[PDB]
Amino acid sequence: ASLLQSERVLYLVQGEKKVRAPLSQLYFCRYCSELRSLECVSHEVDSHYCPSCLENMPSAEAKLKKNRCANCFDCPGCMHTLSTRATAYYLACGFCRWTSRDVGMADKSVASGGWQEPDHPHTQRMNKLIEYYQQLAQKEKVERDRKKLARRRKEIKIEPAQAVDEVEPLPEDYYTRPVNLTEVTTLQQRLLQPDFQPICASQLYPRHKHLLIKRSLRCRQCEHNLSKPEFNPTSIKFKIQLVAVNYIPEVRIMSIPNLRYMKESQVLLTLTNPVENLTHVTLLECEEGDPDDTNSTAKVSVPPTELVLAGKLAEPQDFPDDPDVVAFRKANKVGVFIKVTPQREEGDVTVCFKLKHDFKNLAADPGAEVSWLTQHVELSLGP
Amino acid sequence: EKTAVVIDLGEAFTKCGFAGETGPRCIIPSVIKKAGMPKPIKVVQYNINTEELYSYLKEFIHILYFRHLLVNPRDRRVVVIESVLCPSHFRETLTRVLFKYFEVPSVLLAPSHLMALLTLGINSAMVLDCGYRESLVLPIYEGIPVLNCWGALPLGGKALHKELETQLLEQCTVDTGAAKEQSLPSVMGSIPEGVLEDIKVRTCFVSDLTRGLKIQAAKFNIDGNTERPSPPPNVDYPLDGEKILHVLGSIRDSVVEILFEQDNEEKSVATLILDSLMQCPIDTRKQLAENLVIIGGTSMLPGFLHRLLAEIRYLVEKPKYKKTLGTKTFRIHTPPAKANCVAWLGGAIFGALQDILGSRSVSKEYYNQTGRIPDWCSL
Amino acid sequence: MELGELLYNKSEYIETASGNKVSRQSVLCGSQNIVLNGKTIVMNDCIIRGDLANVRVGRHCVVKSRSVIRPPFKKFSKGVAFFPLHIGDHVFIEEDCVVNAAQIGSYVHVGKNCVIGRRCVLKDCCKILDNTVLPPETVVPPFTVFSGCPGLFSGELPECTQELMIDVTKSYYQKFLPLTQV
Amino acid sequence: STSLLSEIEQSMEAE
Ligand SMILES: Nc1ncnc2c1ncn2[C@@H]1O[C@H](COP(=O)(O)OP(=O)(O)OP(=O)(O)O)[C@@H](O)[C@H]1O
Ligand SMILES: [Mg+2]
Ligand SMILES: [Zn+2]
Ligand SMILES: [Zn+2]
Ligand SMILES: [Zn+2]
Numbered sequence: 001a002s003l004l005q006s007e008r009v010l011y012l013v014q015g016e017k018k019v020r021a022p023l024s025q026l027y028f029c030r031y032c033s034e035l036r037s038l039e040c041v042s043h044e045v046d047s048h049y050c051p052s053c054l055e056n057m058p059s060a061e062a063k064l065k066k067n068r069c070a071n072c073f074d075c076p077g078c079m080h081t082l083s084t085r086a087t088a089y090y091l092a093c094g095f096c097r098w099t100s101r102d103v104g105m106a107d108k109s110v111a112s113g114g115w116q117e118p119d120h121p122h123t124q125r126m127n128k129l130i131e132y133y134q135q136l137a138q139k140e141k142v143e144r145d146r147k148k149l150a151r152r153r154k155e156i157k158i159e160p161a162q163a164v165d166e167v168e169p170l171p172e173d174y175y176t177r178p179v180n181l182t183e184v185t186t187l188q189q190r191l192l193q194p195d196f197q198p199i200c201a202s203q204l205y206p207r208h209k210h211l212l213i214k215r216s217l218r219c220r221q222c223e224h225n226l227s228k229p230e231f232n233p234t235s236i237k238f239k240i241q242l243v244a245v246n247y248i249p250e251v252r253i254m255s256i257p258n259l260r261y262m263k264e265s266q267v268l269l270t271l272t273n274p275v276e277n278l279t280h281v282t283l284l285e286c287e288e289g290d291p292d293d294t295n296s297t298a299k300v301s302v303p304p305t306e307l308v309l310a311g312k313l314a315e316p317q318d319f320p321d322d323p324d325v326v327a328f329r330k331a332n333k334v335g336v337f338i339k340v341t342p343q344r345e346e347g348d349v350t351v352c353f354k355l356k357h358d359f360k361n362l363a364a365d366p367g368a369e370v371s372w373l374t375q376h377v378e379l380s381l382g383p
Numbered sequence: 384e385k386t387a388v389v390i391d392l393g394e395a396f397t398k399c400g401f402a403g404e405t406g407p408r409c410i411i412p413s414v415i416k417k418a419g420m421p422k423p424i425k426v427v428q429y430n431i432n433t434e435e436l437y438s439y440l441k442e443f444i445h446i447l448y449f450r451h452l453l454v455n456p457r458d459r460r461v462v463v464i465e466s467v468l469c470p471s472h473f474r475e476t477l478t479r480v481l482f483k484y485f486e487v488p489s490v491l492l493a494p495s496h497l498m499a500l501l502t503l504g505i506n507s508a509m510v511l512d513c514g515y516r517e518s519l520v521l522p523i524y525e526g527i528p529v530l531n532c533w534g535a536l537p538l539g540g541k542a543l544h545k546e547l548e549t550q551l552l553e554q555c556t557v558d559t560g561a562a563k564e565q566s567l568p569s570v571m572g573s574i575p576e577g578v579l580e581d582i583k584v585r586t587c588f589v590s591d592l593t594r595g596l597k598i599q600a601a602k603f604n605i606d607g608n609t610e611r612p613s614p615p616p617n618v619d620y621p622l623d624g625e626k627i628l629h630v631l632g633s634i635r636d637s638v639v640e641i642l643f644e645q646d647n648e649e650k651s652v653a654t655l656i657l658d659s660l661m662q663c664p665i666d667t668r669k670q671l672a673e674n675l676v677i678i679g680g681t682s683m684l685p686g687f688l689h690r691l692l693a694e695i696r697y698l699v700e701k702p703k704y705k706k707t708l709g710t711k712t713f714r715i716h717t718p719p720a721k722a723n724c725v726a727w728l729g730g731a732i733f734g735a736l737q738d739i740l741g742s743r744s745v746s747k748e749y750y751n752q753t754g755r756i757p758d759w760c761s762l
Numbered sequence: 763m764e765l766g767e768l769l770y771n772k773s774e775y776i777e778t779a780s781g782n783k784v785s786r787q788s789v790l791c792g793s794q795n796i797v798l799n800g801k802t803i804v805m806n807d808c809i810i811r812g813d814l815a816n817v818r819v820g821r822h823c824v825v826k827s828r829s830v831i832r833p834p835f836k837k838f839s840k841g842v843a844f845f846p847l848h849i850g851d852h853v854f855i856e857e858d859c860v861v862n863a864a865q866i867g868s869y870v871h872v873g874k875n876c877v878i879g880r881r882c883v884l885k886d887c888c889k890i891l892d893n894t895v896l897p898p899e900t901v902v903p904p905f906t907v908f909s910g911c912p913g914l915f916s917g918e919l920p921e922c923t924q925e926l927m928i929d930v931t932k933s934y935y936q937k938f939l940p941l942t943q944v
Numbered sequence: 945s946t947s948l949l950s951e952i953e954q955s956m957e958a959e
Contacts, residue, residue, distance in 0.1 A: 001871070001889065001919055001920060001923060001926055001927070002871075002889075003765070003854060003871065003930045003934075004763045004764065004765060004926070004929075004930055004933075005763040006763075006920075006926075008763045009763070022920075024920040024921070024922050024926055025920050025921075027921070039441070043445070043449055044455050045449070045453055045454055045455055048453055049903075051901065051903045051906075051915060052901055053901075054885075054901070054903060059454075062453055066408060067408065067452075067453045078912055079912075079914055080897055080900070080912050080914075081899065081900065081901075083898075083899050093897075094879060094897035094898045094899055094900070095895070095897035095912045120405040120406065122405065122719030122720070123405045125719050126405050126719060126728075126732075129501075129502070129504055129732060130403055130732055130735055132504070133501070133732055133733075133735075133736055134735065134736060137736040137737075137738050137739045138738060140738075140739055141738040141739060141742075144739075144742060158504045159504070160503070160504050160505045161503040161504055161505060161716055161717070161718070163673060163674055163675065163714030163715060163716050163717075164714065164715055164716075164717055165712075165714055166692075167688040167689050167692055167715050168689070169591070169686070169689045170588065170589065170590070170591060170685055170686025170689055170690075174588055174615065174685065174686070175613075175615050176613075176615060176616065177615070177616065178616045178618070179585070179586055179616075179618040181585065181618070181620070181621075184585045185585075186581055186584075186585065187580060187581060187584045187585075190584075191396070191410050191411075191723075194398075194406050194407050194410045194721070194723070194724060195405065195406040196721075197683075197721055197723070199685075210451075211453060212453075212903070212915070213449060213453045215449065227921060233903060233904070234885055234903075234904065236868075236869075236886050236887060236904060236924060238921075241921075243921040243922045243925075245922045245925060245926070246922070246925075252763060252764050253763055253764065254764045268764065416916075776952060776955045777955070778948075778951035778952070778954070778955055779946075779951055779954055779955075780946065780951060782948070782951065784948070784952075790948065790952075793947070793948045793949040793952060794947050794948075794949040795947065796947065796948040796949075797945050797946070797947055797948060798948050798951070812948075818945075
């Protein structure tokens with residue numbers, strides 16, 4: 001991903017929000033010919049899986065277990081999966097040597113299931129309070145429907161919490177005692193256990209590993225899934241694939257000549273479909289698309305060229321020589337020169353231009369093939 | 384009905400989770416890591432253009448809804464805990480983000496103080512929230528927040544961090560370790576916010592009333608002869624590995640005294656409660672005095688509550704409050720949750736009230752029809 | 763941005779029947795036990811330690827210079843031995859890397875100046891950013907960046923990693939042509 | 945499978 005600098009080439013995405021992003025990060029809805037961005041698309045949760053032990057968890061179990069794995073534990077000193085070790089078992093971390101014996105949890109005879117979280121001390125009063133407020137809410141609701149109908153036409157008590165007359169004082173031990181920073185806990189690890197935030201490190205018991213999710217993307221205009229991951233978390237295949245790179249011809253920059261107020265940069269226009277045509281005639285017109293970041297000009301003399309792809313000729317190849325235009329033409333590849341006018345601004349030479357191509361929607365589709373798409377592309381030369 | 388999610392945004396930390404829970408599932412710094420910038424950007428920023436705030440809130444709420452809460456946003460209602468007198472533009476921007484983008488069913492813009500009251504089970508108390516940006520006192524009497532008798536001072540965690548940075552830069556003694564084992568003051572121009580926060584939470588503490596008053600008097604030292612109390616021992620806080628900042632003993636107890644220092648204006652954290660109480664209706668005073676609720680991260684500092692109560696009882700005897708609030712019995716509450724997430728716990732209790740929560744909350748259909756969020760300002 | 767040219771002098775490399783381009787300066791140990799599936803690039807000062815266990819490596823992977831591929835040691839209950847190391851096809855290992863992973867899937871990219879703990883398992887299509895340490899028994903799920911010290915999940919890769927990575931590794935092999943012997 | 949030693953020996957033979 002980062003080996004080739006995808007951020008150099010930014011495609012613009014039409015919609016309510018105007019966003020420039022790399023082609024790899026865009027998704028191409030086939031029902032809506034306009035490609036859609038990650039910000040524009042709607043995200044949904046498809047499945048929960050524990051990252052350490054790649055076990056898929058159903059959503060009901062995720063709610064019951066509070067989005068936490070049943071087995072794995074995250075080390076409190078550093079967020080790393082604690083490993084069970086046998087002497088009769090105890091948790092020990094791999095990066096730092098934080099053992100379960102430090103905080104003082106007795107060794108469990110069974111390997112995995114022995115370890116459990118403490119119960120919240122104030123859960124009983126929480127249940128009492130929520131029950132009382134539920135019945136009060138019921139009374140208020142019944143009053144509301146009574147009033148609505150009028151317009152159209154035992155008990156549970158809770159003892160109030162007692163205010164303490166004298167709060168506990170700061171112990172004298174705080175004065176005249178060196179602070180052992182090993183004993184106290186940093187705020188990050190302290191807040192990792194919000195139920196009982198322990199000031200001492202010996203009272204910071206470990207927590208189960210937080211689950212991750214798989215995301216299913218849905219086009220907002222038409223409720224059609226753009227991408228659907230599979231059930232198995234370790235699986236690499238996707239059920240639905242509508243990534244932009246699979247449909248739009250990808251543009252990359254090959255040559256990066258110097259920007260001393262003159263240059264001639266070569267850029268490749270690779271095709272991804274079996275057959276198509278490309279003609280980058282447009283050069284942003286005048287004040288078309290709002291090329292705010294453009295800081296140069298490219299001639300982009302564009303005779304249309306026909307491209308193909310294969311998973312492995314004179315008129316197709318030799319007659320359209322295009323020596324001043326077409327530099328090199330390999331399989332699913334065509335290089336084109338553009339004369340940049342660099343150093344127009346202070347620096348950071350950026351050129352904006354429009355690339356036109358043809359897409360086969362297959363809605364039924366000769367009319368679909370006849371339709372032409374145009375994408376605004378911002379390249380950023382090194383400068 | 385699906386359980387409603389609960390969000391409490393703050394400058395320092397955001398608390399997130401589900402309703403009807405003993406405590407928040409997630410509590411994180413309110414920042415978003417944008418690519419290319421080393422130090423991340425604060426999500427909740429006031430007085431900025433609405434587009435930037437919209438993008439920040441969008442990214443942060445997406446992180447909350449797909450990294451910490453593992454559930455769709457459309458399915459479940461929202462209970463957003465926003466402090467009273469929160470800036471308006473931030474509030475409508477947040478609701479617009481929740482509705483237009485995420486399409487949640489409805490968001491309840493509950494006030495923090497009333498929610499904090501709900502956790503105890505009482506229906507009247509003087510709720511003081513010592514937030515990051517500022518401390519704020521509000522009295523609640525029978526479920527009615529008395530906005531007329533509000534109070535606020537900018538003595539939250541931000542001022543405390545600034546004071547800590549100033550004191551450290553003054554009495555800086557850091558062992559760089561590269562031929563600088565001796566003290567090398569102010570080797571770094573400015574300490575990052577994280578280091579200051581960790582030093583404050585780990586080392587610093589709130590001293591007793593008498594010790595604090597003696598420290599304040601000895602700061603002037605007008606004709607004084609070693610009147611300061613003996614300080615705690617210095618602590619060698621490691622920075623960046625090799626560097627070792629020798630945090631002096633005096634700072635550890637003198638940095639937090641800015642909260643309780645009067646400074647010829649009669650305005651402090653303790654005096655704030657008395658000032659709010661003296662403005663209340665005549666009948667509401669006693670029930671408000673006997674019921675005091677303290678919430679906020681700053682209140683969690685060790686020895687804060689003892690110093691606060693002692694300072695309240697000390698300032699009551701002064702001539703300004705002697706006539707009215709003289710013979711009063713102040714008593715602090717101990718809510719079930721930690722003071723960081725008492726307001727969240729209140730919002731969570733309110734969330735499980737499924738029947739009322741539909742009517743009280745603002746439906747997305749209403750927002751689309753009108754686009755105006757309810758507020759206690761004139762309509 | 764296409765992959766830039768990276769020329770090498772033909773004298774200090776061996777091109778094999780399967781197409782592996784292994785540098786002469788690379789420290790191959792137990793070469794009878796190592797297996798490369800073809801089109802592999804092993805750069806100079808690469809310490810591939812096949813003398814301990816089967817170190818099999820897939821097609822078109824790139825092992826940049828000063829990188830050590832050492833199979834891990836596992837202490838099982840029955841005794842002790844060295845686990846064989848397996849690397850999938852199309853893996854891009856940056857220079858100054860240390861690899862003790864039990865298994866590295868396909869389409870993986872390890873950042874430069876990285877150390878991988880003992881018996882780590884890297885699933886397919888995962889990235890490790892530069893200056894990162896993965897402690898032992900760390901499992902990287904697919905489509906995730908593991909960065910920091912220790913490596914923690916801090917993002918997700920784009921959708922088209924299976925396509926982008928196989929393009930990048932193929933371009934790297936095709937642009938790794940020998941120097942002109944002028 | 946063709947071990948890397950075999951490939952190195954074949955390359956030496958080619959030279
Ligand atoms: N466990 C703790 N112990 C001590 N101090 C803490 C603790 N947790 C947070 N703090 C400090 O409390 C302050 C944050 O308080 P809090 O989390 O209540 O604010 P917030 O909700 O982020 O902000 P605001 O209410 O102003 O929007 C910061 O100074 C933080 O350092
Ligand atoms: Mg708060
Ligand atoms: Zn697990
Ligand atoms: Zn650890
Ligand atoms: Zn669509």
